[PDB]
Design an enzyme around this catalytic site. Structure first.
Site, PDB file in Angstrom:
ATOM      1  CB  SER A  24       2.064  -0.015  -4.078  1.00 23.52           C
ATOM      2  OG  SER A  24       0.958  -0.838  -3.807  1.00 23.52           O
TER       3      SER A  24
ATOM      4  CE1 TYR B 122      -3.155   4.841  -7.416  1.00 23.04           C
ATOM      5  CE2 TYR B 122      -1.622   2.976  -7.452  1.00 23.04           C
ATOM      6  CZ  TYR B 122      -2.776   3.618  -7.928  1.00 23.04           C
ATOM      7  OH  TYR B 122      -3.531   3.022  -8.920  1.00 23.04           O
TER       8      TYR B 122
ATOM      9  NE  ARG C 269      -7.574   5.875   8.494  1.00 22.34           N
ATOM     10  CZ  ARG C 269      -7.111   7.096   8.169  1.00 22.34           C
ATOM     11  NH1 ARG C 269      -7.742   8.209   8.540  1.00 22.34           N
ATOM     12  NH2 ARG C 269      -6.018   7.202   7.426  1.00 22.34           N
TER      13      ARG C 269
ATOM     14  CD  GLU D 262      -6.291  -1.073  -9.292  1.00 24.50           C
ATOM     15  OE1 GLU D 262      -7.230  -0.625  -8.588  1.00 24.50           O
ATOM     16  OE2 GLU D 262      -5.824  -0.429 -10.229  1.00 24.50           O
TER      17      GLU D 262
ATOM     18  CG  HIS E 275      -1.991   1.088   1.097  1.00 23.18           C
ATOM     19  ND1 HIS E 275      -3.203   0.934   0.466  1.00 23.18           N
ATOM     20  CD2 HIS E 275      -1.944   2.377   1.525  1.00 23.18           C
ATOM     21  CE1 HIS E 275      -3.872   2.078   0.529  1.00 23.18           C
ATOM     22  NE2 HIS E 275      -3.122   2.979   1.149  1.00 23.18           N
ATOM     23  N   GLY E 276       1.069   1.846  -1.183  1.00 22.55           N
ATOM     24  CA  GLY E 276       1.807   3.106  -1.289  1.00 22.55           C
ATOM     25  C   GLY E 276       0.881   4.257  -0.952  1.00 22.55           C
TER      26      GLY E 276
HETATM   27  C1  1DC Z   1      -6.857   9.902  -2.096  1.00 25.36           C
HETATM   28  C2  1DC Z   1      -5.867   9.049  -1.295  1.00 25.36           C
HETATM   29  N1  1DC Z   1      -5.569   7.849  -2.112  1.00 25.36           N
HETATM   30  C3  1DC Z   1      -4.601   6.942  -1.837  1.00 25.36           C
HETATM   31  O1  1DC Z   1      -3.901   6.967  -0.822  1.00 25.36           O
HETATM   32  C4  1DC Z   1      -4.516   5.776  -2.839  1.00 25.36           C
HETATM   33  C5  1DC Z   1      -3.386   4.833  -2.367  1.00 25.36           C
HETATM   34  C6  1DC Z   1      -3.233   3.623  -3.112  1.00 25.36           C
HETATM   35  N2  1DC Z   1      -4.074   3.183  -4.066  1.00 25.36           N
HETATM   36  C7  1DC Z   1      -3.857   2.003  -4.692  1.00 25.36           C
HETATM   37  C8  1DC Z   1      -4.715   1.616  -5.699  1.00 25.36           C
HETATM   38  C9  1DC Z   1      -4.527   0.411  -6.385  1.00 25.36           C
HETATM   39  C10 1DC Z   1      -3.462  -0.397  -6.049  1.00 25.36           C
HETATM   40  C11 1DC Z   1      -2.554   0.009  -5.056  1.00 25.36           C
HETATM   41  C12 1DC Z   1      -2.745   1.205  -4.391  1.00 25.36           C
HETATM   42  C13 1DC Z   1      -1.877   1.623  -3.392  1.00 25.36           C
HETATM   43  O2  1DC Z   1      -0.876   0.991  -3.060  1.00 25.36           O
HETATM   44  N3  1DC Z   1      -2.138   2.824  -2.778  1.00 25.36           N
HETATM   45  C14 1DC Z   1      -6.461   8.783  -0.033  1.00 25.36           C
HETATM   46  C15 1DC Z   1      -7.539   7.901   0.089  1.00 25.36           C
HETATM   47  C16 1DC Z   1      -8.129   7.640   1.339  1.00 25.36           C
HETATM   48  N4  1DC Z   1      -7.642   8.302   2.507  1.00 25.36           N
HETATM   49  C17 1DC Z   1      -6.562   9.220   2.388  1.00 25.36           C
HETATM   50  C18 1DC Z   1      -5.984   9.435   1.120  1.00 25.36           C
END
Ligand code: 1DC
Length: 354
Positions: free
Chosen positions: A244, A247, A222, A336, A206-207
């Site tokens: 990941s 992001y 969350r 994903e 989870h990046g």
């Molecule tokens: C808008 C921001 N979005 C992210 O942190 C997305 C992070 C994320 N998305 C993925 C989607 C598909 C595959 C991997 C990832 C991932 O590693 N991180 C966010 C979303 C929810 N709470 C705080 C911030």
């Protein structure tokens, strides 16, 4: 009378992490990167009420996007009064597409976690009365209510994690591993123990934005109202570090670009595989525990290893990505992995990468 500041108990790497994830510069940088007007919305003036009014303005917009109601321009104007934006003192743009609406929802979700970090830092009344205080970095660490333990080279999982990073990260510019911390956010434990009979656990990437790391450490990953994406309203993970890493919002520090990535143990159970986007999903189908949007590729399953975490076997990929012919026509280049209950993931590791 002057209070004593007690000596910092943290090792150097941890001090630097705690400095980065609570940095006012970092937060303001993040706000500038999201087009926010930091002069009209300083960090200390951010409020839960303002953020809530922002989501109400976007909800009005959403309804209009789907009768003699207010124009998209009028409703945009209202949103931008609530949440001041900066576009070189030109007019901000009208929010008139699903994609831009979601981009504003995502900005507010980041801003809500910035506000969470600010509220967390408020000085309690006990602290004003005690005659000795922790070093500021110990105080900030303690606010997370999350145990972090820096690993060294010969921690049992160190090479396993390094291998996952190297083998599934980009081939040409792989992120460089600086530090791994083991993460124990207690009282994730109880809810996570609920799924102990559920097999099929995998350690997944989870990046994230640097700006939400403190929030994640405090509260776990969350599912927020208004969150979304190509596989709906859940928590998103990848088996390929390179997915990941896309992001990761890092920050320039000295000559380097610093970023953070989590590894979570995810109880996937019985998997439902899809090969086309469904942004409207809120849960797996009946009798499934997760949704995997399957990619053209997957870390070579023949190289999967396992770690033992709290007495459960957790699969950890170690292979380079290979083609999966059955998903060669998938709308997803890389998988994903989705869960739709916060309880099905437990944070396990945090990595600093340059
Ligand atoms: C808008 C921001 N979005 C992210 O942190 C997305 C992070 C994320 N998305 C993925 C989607 C598909 C595959 C991997 C990832 C991932 O590693 N991180 C966010 C979303 C929810 N709470 C705080 C911030």
């Amino acid at each position: 009378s002057m209070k004593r500041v007690q000596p910092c108990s943290l090792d150097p790497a941890t001090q630097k992490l705690i400095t980065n994830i609570f940095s006012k510069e970092m937060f303001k940088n993040t706000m500038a990167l999201m087009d926010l007007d930091v002069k009209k919305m300083p960090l200390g003036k951010l409020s839960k009420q303002q953020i809530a009014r922002g989501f109400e303005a976007l909800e009005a917009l959403e309804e209009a996007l789907k009768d003699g109601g207010q124009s998209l321009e009028e409703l945009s104007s209202h949103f931008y009064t609530v949440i001041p934006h900066n576009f070189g003192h030109s007019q901000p743009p009208p929010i008139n597409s699903p994609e831009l609406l979601q981009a504003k929802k995502d900005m507010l979700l980041v801003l809500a976690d910035i506000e969470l970090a600010q509220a967390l830092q408020a000085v309690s009344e006990q602290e004003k009365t005690v005659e000795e205080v922790p070093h500021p970095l110990d105080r900030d660490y303690q606010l997370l209510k999350c145990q972090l333990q820096l690993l060294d080279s010969g921690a049992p999982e160190y090479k396993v994690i390094q291998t996952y990073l190297e083998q599934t990260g980009s081939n040409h510019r792989c992120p460089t591993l600086q530090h791994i911390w083991k993460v124990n956010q207690e009282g994730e434990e109880d809810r996570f123990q609920a799924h102990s009979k559920l097999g099929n656990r995998k350690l997944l990437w989870h990046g994230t934005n640097m700006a939400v790391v403190a929030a994640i450490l405090t509260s776990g990953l969350r599912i927020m109202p208004h969150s979304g994406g190509r596989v709906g309203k859940g928590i998103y993970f990848a088996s390929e570090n390179s997915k990941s890493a896309g992001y990761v919002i890092g920050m320039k520090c000295g000559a380097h670009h610093v970023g953070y990535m989590f590894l979570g143990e995810v109880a996937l159970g019985r998997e439902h595989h899809i090969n086309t986007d469904n942004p409207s999903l809120k849960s797996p189908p009946p009798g499934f525990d997760s949704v995997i949007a399957r990619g053209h590729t997957e870390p070579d399953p023949t190289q999967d290893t396992e770690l033992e975490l709290d007495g459960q076997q957790v699969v950890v990929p170690q292979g380079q990505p290979v083609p999966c012919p059955e998903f060669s026509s998938s709308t997803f280049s890389q998988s994903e992995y989705l869960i739709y209950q916060e309880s099905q993931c437990r944070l396990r590791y945090l990595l600093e990468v340059h």
